[model samples]
Target chain A: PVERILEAELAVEPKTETYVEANMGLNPSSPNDPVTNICQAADKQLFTLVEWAKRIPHFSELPLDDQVILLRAGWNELLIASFSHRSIAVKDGILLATGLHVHRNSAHSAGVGAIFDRVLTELVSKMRDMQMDKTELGCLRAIVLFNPDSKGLSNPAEVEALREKVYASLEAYCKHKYPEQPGRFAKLLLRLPALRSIGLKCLEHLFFFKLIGDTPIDTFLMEMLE
Target chain B: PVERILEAELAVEPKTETYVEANMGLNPSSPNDPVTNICQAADKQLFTLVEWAKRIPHFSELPLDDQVILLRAGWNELLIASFSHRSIAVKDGILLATGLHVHRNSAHSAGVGAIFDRVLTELVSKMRDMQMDKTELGCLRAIVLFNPDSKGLSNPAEVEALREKVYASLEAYCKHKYPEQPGRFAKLLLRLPALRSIGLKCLEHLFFFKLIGDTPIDTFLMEMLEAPH
Candidate 1:
């Protein structure tokens, strides 16, 4: 009854300012957007993954101290193995070269490619070459895949598949790291069905720059989600 | 098998260290003690609660956001509400008025009592004729109960309990603020447990020299966890 009552009035005041959108290419509807308003985009993304992963059934199922340990280590892993500006720049370059601009809502008609150039220029000088082991590397790669930038596909079918892949990657990472409680992680991975629409909308927005091969209507739908 | 081997080897390293007592407090260990080398007495006590809370079934049972929230809030509450130098001074004063020098470790020891007095002074000044709100007032009273100089009892148990209460109170505040998802607010609250400890420890250490009931430990722990939320 209480849950129903609360759900009936579940209106969070919509925020109109776009602090993160200007910098991180985040869709307007993302909680990650406001987080980046205060902290670095990559840091916010990495931390969000850590927070989200721990909530996975298996991960949260661990002893509280163990969960903290996993969370802390996951945090350390992200920090120590994060993508260098060079790597992000390269990725951004790849997207931009494909006609994608990092910032879509800007005054200038910069494509995702242009946004990547700026991001790359901004980050390339600051990062070190990662030298982590394979498992750690895989975990880091998982971060990249689940990143908001990674799944912004334009095609309805392709976006759906990408959403599944994102969850798969997340589940794989958590299960590998925490084999003792795989079920919890598995359920958490698949439980969040909201990802389908959310991921599609995000992809449609990013693909509006025509980098991901989505049509204009798809991009228009993304704009409407905001 | 490989993981087991690694775990086994890791367990082989000596867990406890033999270190000579460094501070004024009489720690019973050898000069080269490695375990005590990085150890602080208060940290050991505080960790007991942290570790215990972490082990509580309900701790992880909450949403991950709630878990983070609890930890963050608990850490902050511990830093700000657990100890006060002035209260210890008042406690000491009460002891002295009873014609007791009050040994350092004794509950009502003059030194500990003086700490309570200083805590009371802080309470008076900050509280401004006891006009502070319920949370603030409750926190102050909690610290008084935790005063080492109370000359009544030197137990840390009551303090720990009070710390838990403070945590619950803060959690309630967050819930009231974000009824939709109290977990998010809880995460913000529990962000820095270690910093809270550091502040309180520094306060304790600072008071040792100033002839004041200044709790350097409380001061240090509070500083790191002090966010204007």
Candidate 2:
């Protein structure tokens, strides 16, 4: 089946090459440097997600506006689900990325650290408890991306049908993979609201930070959020 | 003009009929009684919104499923926006309903009272600060109800067009009424996100309370949430 093939390919982790890091002459003495760094990191992460989404079967078939709307609305939720293992380590309360290890508590001074910690803690714990695999994560990402509920979509019914198909595939995968656990499917679906709740909080935090700083947000990052 | 007529009618406060309220003979000793009361109130409130929606011009022209989907997605938001002044008084930090004045802190033990308080405070303050009239409120409610982005809608494009009409009306109203504040339209549009945030919180609180007790939720409320049985 095409779904099975896609699932298999999604599950197979792609190999990466260790290359020399690019030097953008980031200044350590400047107070605004961290903000710029964060913006760049955010842009790259969104770009990576968009690239991954483009590769999904029939994703490109969506109208460009619909695709943009879905990406804008679901980007944070997908990021949380897809990058749980890579970015969050609950035990140490650390956020990892690109050789940077920021303490979760560091965001507290900005009034958003608590929300960040809570979301990260809960999502990481759930991921650990479920032992979620890449295939499941991929399916969840697709489900989030094809959300019909995103504001400003042109073909919401089409998006909804696509999401339902992914959801069905995910249900079947869960049933086949964990035949002993009858409650697995329900539990996975329940995580969706939590994802949305946390995503909104994250967005609030980003908006606050952007407002409070002099950093220039990249156009792509702005468009991804719109 | 029709808009002025709507504005005037919307602004006129309606007289209420004083009648004996129905008593469900709720047991005071049972913890579940309050849950039942809450559910019933939720149902009644949703029903009232639906009735009001049916009266909106052109609302009945929409496909029934689209109407249902819109009501399901936007009922909480509309409730908060439309009834904010009648129910919430920010200075008092109280929610007035069913002859009971619930304080802002009363639901803290249940872990949801503060959310109710925060939403009420922000919405009421915004409404007061803007001096929002009933006509603007009606337009906002319609915009929220005609959301194109609601999940499971069969005709999002149609819904979007309806929403755009409401948006244009709102923009025009703002321009005509508050000629000095050129930014009022943008500000009003921005409030939609906040309304949605509060709506989601309200839904979460309802679901939490539902889980904690033996209250039977009405079918209308259940359908609004799309909760799996």
Candidate 3:
């Protein structure tokens, strides 16, 4: 699935590459608090995620309303998935698409944000344990994007069918790469339920409280779910 | 893989069929503590797992030392895998092959055994979510049986080849049965690490502390590690 990972990074790379490398850690500091800088970094990162979805060739087939709903519903998972992917190999903190690094200890004071940071870190660790590669991340992103069961869809079955095709692709990939453990694909898929349990409200609560800690209300809406 | 699940049950059927059905749970009025009864039931359950392994056609090819080591190393996993399989459809506790149900709450007082019980139960719950079938369980049991990397093996390479073959078989089974999830096989295979992480000592600790809470050591030896062809 090098070909699959290639296309995925091809889309993601242009937007993300020109950013980051302060240390084995988060280095580029400013007058701003690390939370404030990281919050802004994550805000810009959402555009990349939304753009990546729109660029998926099949994503546009849904009716406009359905397309909008899909974006709104899954963007939370999409953000975590993207953040997890970018930060998959990084040890210290979450690496957003930009140069900003949100260190674990730094986020500790964001009230509820601190808890979400740990939850986020654990997922990255789990993904790392699975030896999750770029192709798998792309496949996971595809799975998150096409939610057949999402409410008020114009065509749920259409979404389900596409999701099925994506599953077929990932399964084939796992069988080829991990022949010793046929259950590897099944195990990764099982992780979805756990990943989903790391709720958006938890994330948004963290982002909501921290991003606007200085400026308060406006950046709350400013940083999330447009 | 209806064809695959069929062969699996065919082998396990004869030995396990002659057991109990005391309740939708374990009934039949025990004269012993639930621990004593379940421990005895679990002891019998181990024989069924070993028998199941021996009956798998690929198992005999390993050298005697290797065969014995594989059994010793993985029997803990095999027992839990088998118990989880039998009890996958049942709730409230673990089900041994003998139709004995060791309820969650009953096992709660077994100290560390209680912790193991929850871990075991959670695995069952995860298997259920994946809709683990008899065929998948058989594939899982097969995976557990062929420990290529088990130390002290006489012919590790031979064991690995057989394990690889088993992987191919299950992959084929999953692709056909779960077309929508090409990763179904991979997903299930990933459970191996988590399953392995459950620690034999934890299970043994519970078994050791409780099985002979009254009279101990001999049954420990009596129950496990017979090197068979």
Candidate 4:
């Protein structure tokens, strides 16, 4: 029954190249022995393959077929990934056109695909390791140390302590320096906390060492700590 | 020039008990004069002295003169300053009946006034020393040794560093324990800083060890230091 149905379908002659070519805006010279002249056709039916070469050191000037064989033999997944990265750019478009053919033809066929797969898998794993290291370092900086000059005043306790120490030390230092100005001592204590705690802490040390008493570090710290 | 002006303004008045009683608000009919009133008023005027007394043993129930002497033996500046303090009792006639007498009699000029002054000068000096020591301790607590529990998610450089360490440690710990669920690693890191950085720094170590992993103190420190950013 299948043979009878197939015989009936094959009875009609399929449309010749002229019908298909005409729709694609092309006209073959002969019906029996059609010549494909794609240059004149300004539509989908027109396409061409010209001379191709690879620009590698040894077989750079060789034909595309030779380049493919060499690349298949010595191809590295990492090299391919790096070369295909978005940062790469070419000044000549024609060079890119030539390179695409080399890439597809040169890739390994026989068990090579499995090796390339392993290389890519290993590459991804390495990237993940690097990312993990970075993530860990970021966490340590964010959660640990007493950095007064940070953006968020989230480390209140650390900042406050630092501030208080600065004030106390400054007051003690100042008392030794200016024995008569008892009132000044009181003022400094109150004003220290008013400024940023870290600033106050920092300034207390600065003030003790006579580093710029006029500018208030405490106030600066207060703003930061707050 | 100052002495000339002072002599011209000064007026000599009779040292009469009547005048002293009137000025000091002492009782006219009784022998209980400014001296007696001052002794009584000493009890009410000396708040700091009473506070100081509590620190000492067997001083609270001393005889009135001895108490007066002890209160007087301290620095007079705080007492002098206290008299200047405007009391509603002094103003509203509650203390007016004999308050002025007690206050006036306690001044440095009167016989008892000298003794009170001497005692106060010594006591106040000693109190100042004690206070200074206590203040130092407070400074140490508040400033030098403070560690905040959770550092809020502010973007300060130090806080950021701390947060990064927290995330790194948490991730590493969770990855080790729950390897199948990698997403839980990030979750663990997030939870660590929230728990440790938010609380007091000293207490934070406890929370971290209790919940994060059974890490040794030194190991934890090393891990925190070496954690990825």
The numbered model that scores best in lDDT is 3
At residue B87, give the lDDT of candidate 4: 21
**Per-prediction DockQ:** 0.01, 0.04, 0.07, 0.01
What tens digits encode model 4's per-residue C-alpha lDDT throughout B160-214? 2332333334334445656675444322212212221222221323321232223
- In terms of DockQ, the best-performing candidate is 3
Question: Could you tell me which residue pairs clash in candidate 2?
Answer: none
Better of 1 and 4 by TM-score: 1
Native-referenced TM-scores of chain A, all candidate models: 0.26, 0.74, 0.76, 0.19
Return whichever of 1 and 2 wins on lDDT.
2
The TM-score obtained by model 1 is: 0.20
Please give the distance, in angstroms, between residue B103's alpha carbon in candidate 3 and its true position after superposition: 32
lDDT of 1 by residue, B1-229 (tens): 2222223223321122211123233445543433352355446535643553444333344445444445543443343333332123333321211222233344233244444333333322323332333343333223222322122233423433443444445445545655664233222222222223333433654433333224544665576579564
Q: How accurate is candidate 4 locally (lDDT)?
A: 0.29
Write model 4 residue lDDT over A1-226, tens digit each, in one string: 1222123222221243433443232433522211122222212111110111121112234334433443332222112222222112322111111122112113322323333232222222222322222222111211122222223344433432442343344344445656765433332222111112222232324321211111133344455677
Ranking by DockQ: 3, 2, 1, 4
TM-score of chain A taken by itself, candidate 4: 0.19
Task: Give the runs in model 3 whose Cα sits over 4 Å from its true position.
Answer: A1-6, A14-17, A21-43, A117-121, A201-204, A208-226, B1-229
List the lowest-lDDT window of 10 residues for candidate 3 chain A: A22-31
Higher-ranked by DockQ: 2 or 3: 3
Residue lDDT tens for model 2, B64-140: 88888888878777766765654433365433332334445555644666665556555676677667767777777
